[PDB]
Amino acid sequence: HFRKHWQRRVRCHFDQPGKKVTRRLARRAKAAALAPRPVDKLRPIVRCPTVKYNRRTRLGRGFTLEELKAAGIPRLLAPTIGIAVDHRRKNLSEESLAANVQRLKDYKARLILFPRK
Amino acid sequence: RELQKRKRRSSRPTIRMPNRRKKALNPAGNNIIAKSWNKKETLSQNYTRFGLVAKLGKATGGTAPGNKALLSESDAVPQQQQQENHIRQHDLELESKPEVLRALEREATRPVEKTVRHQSEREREWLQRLVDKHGDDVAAMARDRKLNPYQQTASDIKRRLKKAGLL
Amino acid sequence: GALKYLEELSKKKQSDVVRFLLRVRCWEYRQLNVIHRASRPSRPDKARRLGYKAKQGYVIYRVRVRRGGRQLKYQRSLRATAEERVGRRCSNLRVLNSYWVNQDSTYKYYEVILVDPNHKAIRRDPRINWICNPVHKHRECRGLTSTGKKSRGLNKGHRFNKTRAGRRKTWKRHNTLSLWRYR
Amino acid sequence: GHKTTRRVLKERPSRRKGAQSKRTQFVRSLIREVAGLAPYERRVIELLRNGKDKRARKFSKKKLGTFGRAKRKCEELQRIIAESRRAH
Amino acid sequence: IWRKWHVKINQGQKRFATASALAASAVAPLLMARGHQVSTVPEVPLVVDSAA
RNA sequence: GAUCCUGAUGUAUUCGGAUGGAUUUGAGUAGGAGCGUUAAGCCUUGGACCCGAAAGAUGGUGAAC
RNA sequence: AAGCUCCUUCGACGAGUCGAGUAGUUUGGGAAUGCUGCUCAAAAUGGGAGGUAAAUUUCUUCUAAAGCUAAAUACCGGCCA
RNA sequence: UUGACCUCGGAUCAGGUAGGAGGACCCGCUGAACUUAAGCAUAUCAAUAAGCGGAGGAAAAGAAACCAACAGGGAUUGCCCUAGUAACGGCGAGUGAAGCGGCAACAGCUCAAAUUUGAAAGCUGGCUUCGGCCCGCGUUGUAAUUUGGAGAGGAUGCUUU
């Protein structure tokens, strides 16, 4: 499979450790900007779509509005205190709702919220 | 290449760029994290020494030892074990250890002032004129078209009177 | 108010009122210049839904484009040709959008809403001053208007696999031999 | 497959993105009378006034491209005929 | 530049080699056969107290 | 696994295959051998051991028959 | 000025655009894979795309024809190291 | 007779803006042939080279008329595997994806379709003693409110600047 001019389109990766250093320094810069805050936002537990991966779960995009309302977190405050919100996802069942609500109250139990001024 | 050959033979100076990065790599200021941040330690070790969580996501590689930073039912209701239609909107009602953690709790728990919002002179004059004609009948004050041009409800006027201290 | 009625009228283009008005206007436009300044939009509902505002800094420009093939068909749309010709006449303006206003046997007429990026009424408005940034210089020449977005196949789905992020970038990504350090 | 307790979902506001609104129906009816008819709609209406419904449906299908669009157009023009006779 | 510059070695073989090198370092004739001047060294795995 | 008949108890009454037989097959089972790496050899494709046409195409420079 | 709650009140969503026929071009891709030119030309409990032999197109999932937006990505050129 | 409106022009009037360069990377338009198939025309080369137009420090794309058939996922981009699989093909040469899964990075929004109608509340210019004064744009619609996993209006009681 070398029918085309592959010489002009070879990508080497001699900058792999340098890019790893760059990524770690970017994370350090994020830490410097957000000093007591975590560098990541909280994300829900979701089930993998297909039948092949139905058994396992992973991290989602953001919490459903029903999950936030059931956990006692208002919708507008949630992105400002480190929680990700996804308006597209639906719960569709009482078992993902309970799991992500438990995740949200676990996050609330370990949060140090500071006053505005 | 021709430009670089030109500058090599030119007497014009080589303009050396300082290594000014767009983003600072260390926190700064007079806050708690800045005075306890070790510049020779990584993010994970610093957040371990603080007693805080650095990454809320799933672990993506192996960590060093001691990381500590890379984290009846009558109606069948799954949520009734989760309990402890309007909620407070602008804040939460949340109810040995490292020193930075204790300092953060202390500075987050310290009492603050409120800066209670007062009332304008014209609003106080309006509420005063409203009291001088009816006294306490808030229903009559709401009915009054002359002294209450914006036809406000008696509950709103009672709340404004209570805030003014005019009962 | 009235724009709902005008939208419903614009949806019946062979009815008697709209056919009569289209023919009279086509006659006038045919006898005008190819690219001529229009004082106001002939279709205010259509211009308003495309972002035209009756504010200093907004300009309409009517343009006629010869219709037909280039059996080699021109892969460029006639509406894209209209915006490009107007964008060269008004090289100080930014092409915001354009829309069909009329068609004849030999021409198709389009109106192009342009925006002046140097007017202070545009530079102070946070809803339009994104066009003041120099990355929006000649959007019609890089396929960045509505016709450009349609002709480049910039849609989501399995039907747009090779074009949704750029056809040539996708081709360069698929034709690149990636050799890592540890092989 | 797996057993889970299905929830009743909140009503989607994106449901029925057409029009159940009476004002848009009013505007559509008023514009129809003001604007008039297309030439092909006038041919379909002159076939429908003569009772030649089969020819009207074939003509509409030929000039619209789908049997469903032809059916919808023929029902709309028959409704226009009905209100025109009622006003007459 | 797309010559193979780096070599992938199994981590098990690298740990085997590191353990073999550690075991060889505890043998003093291997220390002098490598070229180290240890004729005044009291014990070949030269352990000093951490307090120093 | 599957194929050739004999065609059980049974069957929702139109479904099923129990017993006895076949010159059966298979990259089938019958107590796993693979994964990774190094060195050497061979094969295919890239300029492909080195040098060596007439051509063809794209874009330009000039004239003057 | 702002968020939330409640409801004997309301809730407007982009048209020579979808689509049909046809000629090129392109794609692994005739639900034409996408695009374009010509002819005709829509809808409103609508429209698009999928699932399904399962008894009829049951069900599922989104809203096109207006627009903006950092990061992770590329880099034989520019200022350097 | 006079004054509006609309439309089309002039001015060495005032304030601005575009052209060229560069073009490694990027976004479009246009577009070959040699070669392989031991000949060659479909095919390949290659949606490449050359040519033309347009930007930036990145560009482009981008917040589903998406993927999916799930116990569901949830803007875009890129890496890994998917996978030389599906699919297409003088079924020869060959051409050749994508969903899921692991990761890097993550951020959401602005309009049009509403009557502010108890008050165009909006904006470009000129003059300035710089504080507020004029002409104009605009009702064929400039502010505020709203953008359909929404929203508005009333009522209601807390909580925010």
C181 and E CB contact within 8 Å: yes
Q: How far apart are CA C143 and CA C79, in angstroms?
A: 11
Give residues with Cβ within 8 angstroms of A84, minimum separation 6: A41, A42, A43, A44, A61, A62, A63
Residues 94-113 of C with CB under 8 A from D: none
CA A52 remoteness from chain centre: 23
Q: Which chains touch E (3 or more CB pairs under 8 A)?
A: A, C
Q: How far apart are CA D29 and CA C8, in angstroms?
A: 10
Interface test with E, best of A14, A15, A16 (most E CBs within 10 A): A14
Tell the burial category of A46 from Cβ atoms under 10 Å away from its Cβ (0-12, 13-18, 19+).
Answer: middle
- Look at residues C138, C131, C133, C126 and name the one whose alpha carbon lies nearest to residue C91: C138
Helix orientation angle between C2-10 and C16-30, rounded to the nearest 10 degrees = 80
Helix, strand or coil, per DSSP, at residue A10: strand
CA distances from E16 to B128, D87, E44 (A): 92, 101, 22
Please list every residue in chain D whose beta carbon sits closer than 8 Å to the beta carbon of residue C8: 27-28, 31
**DSSP element (H, E) containing C171:** helix C167-174
Amino acid occupying residue A117: K
A66 and D CB contact within 8 Å: yes
The nucleotide minimizing the C1' distance to residue C39's CA is H7
The number of beta carbons lying within 10 Å of the beta carbon of residue D80 is 17
- Look at residues C90, C104, C70, C179 and name the one whose alpha carbon lies nearest to residue C137: C90
**DSSP element (H, E) containing B129:** helix B121-134
Cβ contact, residue pair A16, C176, below 8 Å: no
Residues 3-42 of D with CB under 8 A from A: 4-7, 9-10
The number of beta carbons lying within 10 Å of the beta carbon of residue D70 is 20
Q: For residue C38, what are the β-bridge partners?
A: C60
Q: How far apart are CA A16 and CA A10, in angstroms?
A: 15
Query: Tell me, what DSSP letter sits at residue D10?
Result: P
Cβ–Cβ < 8 Å for A31, B27: yes
Cβ contact, residue pair A91, D10, below 8 Å: no
Give residues with Cβ within 8 angstroms of C162, minimum separation 6: C153, C170, C171
The token pair that represents C85 in the structure block? 């010709």
* Resolution as reported, in Å: 3.0
CA B27 remoteness from chain centre: 19
Q: How far apart are CA C138 and CA C148, in angstroms?
A: 12
Q: For residue B6, what are the β-bridge partners?
A: none
The token pair that represents A88 in the structure block? 């597209």
**DSSP element (H, E) containing A26:** helix A16-33
C3 and D CB contact within 8 Å: no
Q: How far apart are CA C88 and CA C59, in angstroms?
A: 14
A16 and E CB contact within 8 Å: no
Please list every residue in chain E whose beta carbon sits closer than 8 Å to the beta carbon of residue C181: 5-6
Cβ contact, residue pair A95, D7, below 8 Å: no
CA distances from B100 to A35, B44, B52 (A): 12, 15, 9
Burial annotation E27-38 (CB, 10 A radius, 16+ → b, else e): eeeebeeeeeee
Cβ–Cβ < 8 Å for D73, D38: no
Burial annotation D30-54 (CB, 10 A radius, 16+ → b, else e): ebbeebbbbeebebbbebbeeeeee
Interface test with D, best of C10, C11, C12 (most D CBs within 10 A): C12
Query: Tell me, what DSSP letter sits at residue A42?
Result: B
Cβ–Cβ < 8 Å for C108, C78: yes
The number of beta carbons lying within 10 Å of the beta carbon of residue B87 is 13
Cβ contact, residue pair C181, A4, below 8 Å: no
Cβ contact, residue pair C183, E4, below 8 Å: yes
Pairing of strands A57-59, C35-38: unpaired
Q: How far apart are CA B10 and CA C116, in angstroms?
A: 44
Biggest CA pair distance of chain A: 66
Task: Please check whether strand F approaches the CB of E7 to within 7 Å.
Answer: yes
Interface test with A, best of D3, D4, D6 (most A CBs within 10 A): D4
CA C139 remoteness from chain centre: 10
Instruction: Please name the residue that has the structure tokens 């509005």.
Output: A65
- Look at residues B73, B64, B24 and name the one whose alpha carbon lies nearest to residue B45: B64
Task: Please check whether strand G approaches the CB of A17 to within 7 Å.
Answer: no
Torsion angle, alpha carbons of C91, C97, C103, C108, to 10: 40
Query: Tell me, what DSSP letter sits at residue A82?
Result: T
C156 and A CB contact within 8 Å: no
- CA of A22 vs C1' of G73, distance in Å? 14
C178 and E CB contact within 8 Å: no
Task: Please check whether strand G approaches the CB of D1 to within 7 Å.
Answer: no
Helix, strand or coil, per DSSP, at residue B32: helix
- Look at residues B69, B84, B78, B163 and name the one whose alpha carbon lies nearest to residue B116: B163
Query: Tell me, what DSSP letter sits at residue C182?
Result: -
Experimentally determined by:
cryo-EM
Please list every residue in chain D whose beta carbon sits closer than 8 Å to the beta carbon of residue A48: none
Please list every residue in chain C whose beta carbon sits closer than 8 Å to the beta carbon of residue A19: none
Task: Please check whether strand F approaches the CB of A7 to within 7 Å.
Answer: yes
**DSSP element (H, E) containing A38:** none
Instruction: Go through chain E and tell me how many residues it has.
Output: 52
**Nearest residue on chain C to A10, alpha-carbon basis:** C177
Helix, strand or coil, per DSSP, at residue C107: strand
CA distances from D11 to A90, B40, D14, D15, D16 (A): 12, 55, 9, 8, 11
Query: Tell me, what DSSP letter sits at residue D27?
Result: H
CA A33 remoteness from chain centre: 19
Q: How far apart are CA A101 and CA A44, in angstroms?
A: 9
CB pairs under 8 A, 24+ apart, for C64-73?
Answer: C64/C29, C64/C30, C64/C34, C64/C107, C64/C108, C64/C109, C65/C107, C65/C108, C65/C109, C65/C110, C66/C106, C66/C107, C67/C103, C67/C106, C67/C107, C67/C108, C68/C106
Cβ–Cβ < 8 Å for A63, A84: yes
Cβ–Cβ < 8 Å for B55, B69: yes
Cβ contact, residue pair D10, A66, below 8 Å: yes
The number of beta carbons lying within 10 Å of the beta carbon of residue C94 is 21
Query: Tell me, what DSSP letter sits at residue C63?
Result: E
Please list every residue in chain A whose beta carbon sits closer than 8 Å to the beta carbon of residue B45: none
Angle, vertex CA A89, rays to CA A79 and CA B83, nearest 5 = 70
Query: Tell me, what DSSP letter sits at residue B89?
Result: S
CA A82 remoteness from chain centre: 10
Query: Tell me, what DSSP letter sits at residue B112?
Result: -
CB pairs under 8 A between A and E: 4
**Nearest residue on chain E to A10, alpha-carbon basis:** E2
Q: How far apart are CA C84 and CA C141, in angstroms?
A: 6
Cβ–Cβ < 8 Å for B102, B81: no
- CA of B15 vs C1' of G16, distance in Å? 60
Please list every residue in chain A whose beta carbon sits closer than 8 Å to the beta carbon of residue D1: 51, 54
In strand H, the nucleotides that come within 7 Å of a protein beta carbon are 6-9, 15-19, 26-31, 44-48, 53-62, 64-81, 84, 94-98, 100-108, 110-115, 118, 122-125, 136-143, 148-150, 154-161
